[PDB]
Amino acid sequence: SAVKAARYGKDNVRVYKVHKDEKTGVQTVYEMTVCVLLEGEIETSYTKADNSVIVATDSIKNTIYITAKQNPVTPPELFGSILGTHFIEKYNHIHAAHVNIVCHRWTRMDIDGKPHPHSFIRDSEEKRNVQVDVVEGKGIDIKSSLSGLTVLKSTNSQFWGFLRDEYTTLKETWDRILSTDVDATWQWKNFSGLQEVRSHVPKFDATWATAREVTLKTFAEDNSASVQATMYKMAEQILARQQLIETVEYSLPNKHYFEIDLSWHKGLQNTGKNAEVFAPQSDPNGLIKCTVGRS
Amino acid sequence: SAVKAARYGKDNVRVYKVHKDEKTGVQTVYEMTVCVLLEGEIETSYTKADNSVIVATDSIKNTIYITAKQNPVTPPELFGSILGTHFIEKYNHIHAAHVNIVCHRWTRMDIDGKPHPHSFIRDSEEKRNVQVDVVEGKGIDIKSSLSGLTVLKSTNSQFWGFLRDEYTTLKETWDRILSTDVDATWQWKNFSGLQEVRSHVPKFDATWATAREVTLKTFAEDNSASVQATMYKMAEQILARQQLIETVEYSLPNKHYFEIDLSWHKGLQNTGKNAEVFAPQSDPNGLIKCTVGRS
Amino acid sequence: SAVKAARYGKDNVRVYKVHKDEKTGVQTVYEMTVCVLLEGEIETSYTKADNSVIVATDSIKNTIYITAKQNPVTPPELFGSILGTHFIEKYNHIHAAHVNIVCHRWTRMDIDGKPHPHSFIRDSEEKRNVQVDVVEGKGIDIKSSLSGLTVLKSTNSQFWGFLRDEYTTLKETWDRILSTDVDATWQWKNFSGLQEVRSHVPKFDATWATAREVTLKTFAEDNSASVQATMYKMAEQILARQQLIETVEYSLPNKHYFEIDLSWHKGLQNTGKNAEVFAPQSDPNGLIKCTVGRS
Amino acid sequence: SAVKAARYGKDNVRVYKVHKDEKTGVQTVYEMTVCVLLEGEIETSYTKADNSVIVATDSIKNTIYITAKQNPVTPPELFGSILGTHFIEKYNHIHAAHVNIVCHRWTRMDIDGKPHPHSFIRDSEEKRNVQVDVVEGKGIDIKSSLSGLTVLKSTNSQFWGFLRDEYTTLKETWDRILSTDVDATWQWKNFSGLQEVRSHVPKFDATWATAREVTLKTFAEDNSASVQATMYKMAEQILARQQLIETVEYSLPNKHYFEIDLSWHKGLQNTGKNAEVFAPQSDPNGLIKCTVGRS
Ligand SMILES: O=c1[nH]c(=O)c2nn[nH]c2[nH]1
Ligand SMILES: O=c1[nH]c(=O)c2nn[nH]c2[nH]1
Ligand SMILES: O=c1[nH]c(=O)c2nn[nH]c2[nH]1
Ligand SMILES: O=c1[nH]c(=O)c2nn[nH]c2[nH]1
Ligand code: NA
Ligand code: NA
Ligand code: NA
Ligand code: NA
């Protein structure tokens, strides 16, 4: 037998950082969960019990805290690039670092119409994520994403004209509920190293904001022919607005809400144009994916 | 042996309702999870296999949908009271109904600065709940609550002057992070029946809004001596603003964020006044509760 | 306003303890999650910011580890009683301690037909729990339980003869699937203090084993007329086998598995006597409870 | 813009099937959760709102139930292969089907030492999974796995001799606790189609059993030099025992249990050779992966 692939590191490292403006008294907090996995010339730890090649996962944990102390943690694309580069430069025999960061929302509270200097609320479990792969001699590959953005529209979704055969029971519809949890990922062109990532720093927050805005507006305004058609419209717009993105991937569940026929009870009308009360279905769910790139 | 207590019903009934304004084209959605448990002269279903006394839990499920079709589902205090009253009036041998409702957030989207007519976002997993106990001859008892409101302040929390003995290692502090998930319950005076609940309908949404506002402002503005002292201030204010509330109960975890001593690494300073990077602790957590009533 | 009730402490304290037999080399592990909440003369911490009355929750955490180091952690009824008694005896102004323990399964592995000396498997998420309330001058109240015991029988469950009215759509059946997650609690007679709890130590593990065995055998062998009737049979037997138990409470979900009519597809027969493929329903679910005591 | 990749289908389809032996009266149940995603000539549903190419996800759901009615559902490798093949053969424009199956445990109850004919228990949340990719003209690729197998050993694990530098605080140890949740995947050689999969049917259950047995015995008996070294030993043995497997992948968290220094309290000794009480850590955790193939 032979080791074909190996990676190891530390997962689920929770990190909080506070920034304190001495002039204004305003504080800003960041909270993330970080995973770092390393690859390199480490096969002998598996095959020969040679621990000399192992940077202990506990040390990886320490390094994450030290790096957060000495560097900006925002935008997460930058922090992830700094963290991954550290490992490949510091250790001769480590040749790739894989950094995943999940950013948790701490949104500044408004009290009496004014932003509070040091109080925050978790407004939703929506996350902003990055995956950064730093590979020696091959640069820095970054995939940015938003996830856990849960939306619903109560009309202006249709689904008709699909294939009908002996396995089909679904009725065509011209008015249904559409609800989903949005997972959207944009993949940046390869960067040559940290200097290049640093050169593009302002684009990271701006592109996240654009991706979010395009997703929300398109969902709200499209008279949707299907999840497929609506998601493609979102991806097309993101690619148009940021030239440094190579591909956009969406993964969308179709979280079904079923009509409830109540006509058995005193002829109560609750279907079609008379539908008011629906039964949300926990499972199963449609799952629709697409990756959109440039012509 | 004898049956000392019994209750049965349907849990986890998901319900969605849409309201459509024909004049303006605006749609408003409500989504809840409902549990209804019944009590009454039902012992023989347990002791003698006498199913004749059982209103099937499937029928309870149907009744929830029918009731939602025929009645307002907001405020949830009213809907719960209507639903519970139905069971005790309809069935001679059912003498109490226990209705629990969890309301899920569907907040209207703003697109380009204007409220969208039929698109919604789940902004946080904060819930608004009710527990309604309808008991034949004893009226309607309602407990309203908010839960899952997650907040953090990065300074203006202290904890010193506590008991110190041979079990104590905790250092006194004059500046710490305070973070919690708020669970707050206000218990209404007993209502004589549905007519009385109907008479107070506007107070339900207004009191929820007050409870939320008081919680947020007090958390943000109190220079907190302890979770205990801050929570008492919240409860006192709610009781002052709504005379029809008898008690307010808070249950607050203290979600700890620990300093990380990095001085072992190149004398890096990250404690006390120099603390910037902290380690959020998933467990254990303090848990602090109090019920506040009137003198 | 006045403080009507207050309790505070530490939740989610994970504890592991190992016992090592020096003679045989056999090791035995215990893992639990512990919560301890205290009550007493502590109102002033809430009303006056008087922390002098607060035993810090961090100190409660330390005490749990110290107590586990110095005492047996099994049976959990005993450990909980020792832990609660400590707080009311040590602190003059603390008058009640509420201890909740969840015991996690670590079952000794069999390798090649022989029990391994120091390797364990988590065989299911079934838990054994205790709630111990130690109240100064009022003794020790213990509720023992098992939870998370998930079972299914594929036949020998019926449900017919229930109330039928205009809200009823459920068909009577003489053969259905029955599946549930068992939550069973037995409440001991009040104990005067630790000496009395110590006197009954062997009864705790034996009664847990009896409760589990009675639950499994009754579920498997009863030709069930309803969840109600089957659960009552379980409770009756437990009360018969242990005189020191005052009440037994069961709380059982009815986790539905629905028939799927496939007759629309080539007249395929999959209902009634021909039912082979079913759709498990995640929600809603029936919920049936009963508390059984002595005549 | 252009569609670079697309797949869509139905996720979270829960399925139960019962087999009834008429001769013996013995019943056997199977429960799974199934996901099926399709690929093919479907770009126009995204780009042109052309639904004519869409096999509705609802129809995919129906097909799963129909297929389960007409075919064995065990071993899951076979069922997944039948299900995937159906889609590529039935629909001209569908060229790949991706089937994921999670099998849930329903283990026959022993009552009074004898196997019960129709009663089952969920003994642990361990799963047996398959991923089957059926690609037109390219055969059938199957990855089989077990997951959620949670184990702990209380001694006979070591970790010393790792890299030490200025980021290192971890002490070397010759005796620690090792606990993990095992995720193990074996990838079969490509099969030419269903006939070939059918030819190897007995190997599927036997290889799963071997993988499980090798994992448990190796974990229990290895005096482990590291997670890396122990996992490699497991993989090597599986590859030796089944020639039709090409690679074995393990992904193992290192779920840490920390010593608790209690010496501050009356010089209590609870570290090193005196360690009895430990603190399980929920996070962070090491994460160690390896893929082992043939020389
Ligand atoms: O088994 C281990 N492998 C590792 O890579 C490691 N790093 N810290 N502790 C560890 N234990
Ligand atoms: O066992 C049952 N008990 C009930 O109360 C019930 N209601 N619907 N189905 C049921 N099954
Ligand atoms: O606010 C607090 N209240 C308490 O009771 C406590 N105990 N430890 N830290 C604490 N913080
Ligand atoms: O938007 C949809 N896309 C689909 O592929 C589908 N299949 N069923 N319903 C559906 N809705
Ligand atoms: Na390197
Ligand atoms: Na009545
Ligand atoms: Na006392
Ligand atoms: Na095809």
The residues, any chain, with a CB within 8 Å of residue B36's CB and separated by 6 or more, are: B9, B10, B13, B60, B63, B64, B83, B84, B87, B97, B98, B99, B100
Contact criterion met (CB below 8 Å) for C188 and C219: no
Count of domains in chain B?
1
Burial of C273 (0-12, 13-18, 19+ CB in 10 A): exposed
Is cis: bond before D117, omega within 30 of 0? no
Burial of B6 (0-12, 13-18, 19+ CB in 10 A): buried
For residue D288, CA distances in Å to C75, C177, D164, D185, D294 come to 36, 42, 19, 14, 20
CATH number at residue B65: 3.10.270.10
Task: Tell me whether strands C285-293 and D27-40 are parallel, antiparallel or unpaired.
Answer: unpaired
Chains in contact with D, counting 3 or more C-beta pairs less than 8 Å apart as contact: A, B, C
In the block, residue with structure tokens 């969890």: B102
Enter the DSSP assignment of D37: E
Task: Please indicate whether, in this complex, the C-beta atoms of A262 and B111 are within 8 angstroms of each other.
Answer: no
Query: How far away, in angstroms, is D227 Cα from ligand 1 center?
Result: 7
Residues from chain D contacting residue B282 (CB–CB below 8 Å): 282-283
Amino acid letter at D278? F
Residues 135-174 of C with CB under 8 A from D: 149-156
For every residue of D200-217, DSSP letters joined together read THHHHHHHHHHHHHHHHH
Task: Please indicate whether, in this complex, the C-beta atoms of C228 and B45 are within 8 angstroms of each other.
Answer: yes
Amino acid letter at B44? T
d(CA B183, CA B102): 13
d(CA D216, CA D220): 6
B111 interface with C at CB cutoff 8 Å: no
Query: How far away, in angstroms, is A93 Cα from ligand 5 center?
Result: 5
Element (H, E) at B289: strand B285-293
In the block, residue with structure tokens 């000496």: C195
Side-chain half-sphere of B229: how many Cα atoms within 13 Å? Answer: 20
Which residue does chain A place closest to D228, by CA atoms?
A46
d(CA A171, CA D215): 49
d(CA D79, CA D271): 52
In the block, residue with structure tokens 């607060």: C54
In total, chain D counts a number of residues equal to 295
> 3-state class of C8 per DSSP?
strand
d(CA B109, CA A153): 10
Cα-trace Rg, chain D: 24
Tokens found for residue B32: 């809840």
Task: Tally Cβ neighbours within 10 Å of residue D212.
Answer: 16
**Technique behind the model:** X-ray
For residue C270, CA distances in Å to A271, C263, C275, D34, D76 come to 28, 7, 4, 20, 21
Ligand number with the minimum distance to the CA of C49: 3
For every residue of D226-270, DSSP letters joined together read -HHHHHHHHHHHHHHH-TTEEEEEEEEEE--EEE---TTTTT---
d(CA A128, CA A32): 10
Name the nearest CA neighbour of C176 among C281, C246, C292. Answer: C281
Enter the DSSP assignment of B173: B
In total, chain C counts a number of residues equal to 295
Name the nearest CA neighbour of D259 among D246, D244, D274. Answer: D274
Enter the DSSP assignment of C224: B
Residues from chain C contacting residue A264 (CB–CB below 8 Å): 169
Residues of D with a catalytic annotation lie at 10, 57, 256
Burial of B31 (0-12, 13-18, 19+ CB in 10 A): buried
d(CA A211, CA C101): 47
Residues from chain C contacting residue B294 (CB–CB below 8 Å): 1-2
End-to-end Cα, chain B, rounded Å: 43
Query: How far away, in angstroms, is D223 Cα from ligand 1 center?
Result: 15
Task: Tell me whether strands B139-153 and B178-188 are parallel, antiparallel or unpaired.
Answer: antiparallel
Q: Which residue(s) pair with C104 in the sheet?
A: C31
Contact criterion met (CB below 8 Å) for C114 and C179: no
Task: Please indicate whether, in this complex, the C-beta atoms of B12 and C295 are within 8 angstroms of each other.
Answer: no
d(CA A175, CA A158): 5
Amino acid letter at D19? H
Side-chain half-sphere of A169: how many Cα atoms within 13 Å? Answer: 12
d(CA B89, CA D295): 77
Partner residue opposite A56 with nearest CB, options D168, D235, D295: D168
Element (H, E) at A184: strand A178-188
d(CA A54, CA D159): 11
Contact criterion met (CB below 8 Å) for A119 and A108: yes
Burial B159-189 (b: 16+ CB within 10 A, else e): bebbeeeebbebeeeeebbbbbbbbbbbbbe
Side-chain half-sphere of C16: how many Cα atoms within 13 Å? Answer: 24
In the block, residue with structure tokens 């530098």: D165
Q: State the sign of the Cα–Cα–Cα–Cα dihedral D187, D188, D192, D196.
A: negative
Element (H, E) at B31: strand B27-40
Ligand number with the minimum distance to the CA of D61: 4
Which residues form the domain of B168?
1-295
Q: What is the resolution of this structure in A?
A: 1.6
Residues from chain C contacting residue A282 (CB–CB below 8 Å): 282-283
Burial D117-138 (b: 16+ CB within 10 A, else e): bbbbbbebbbbbbbbbbbbbee
Partner residue opposite A65 with nearest CB, options B109, B149, B260: B260
Most C-contacting residue of D110, D119, D181, D285 (CB-CB within 10 A), to test interface: D119
B280 interface with A at CB cutoff 8 Å: yes
d(CA C143, CA C187): 4
Minimal C-alpha gap between D37 and chain A (Å): 8
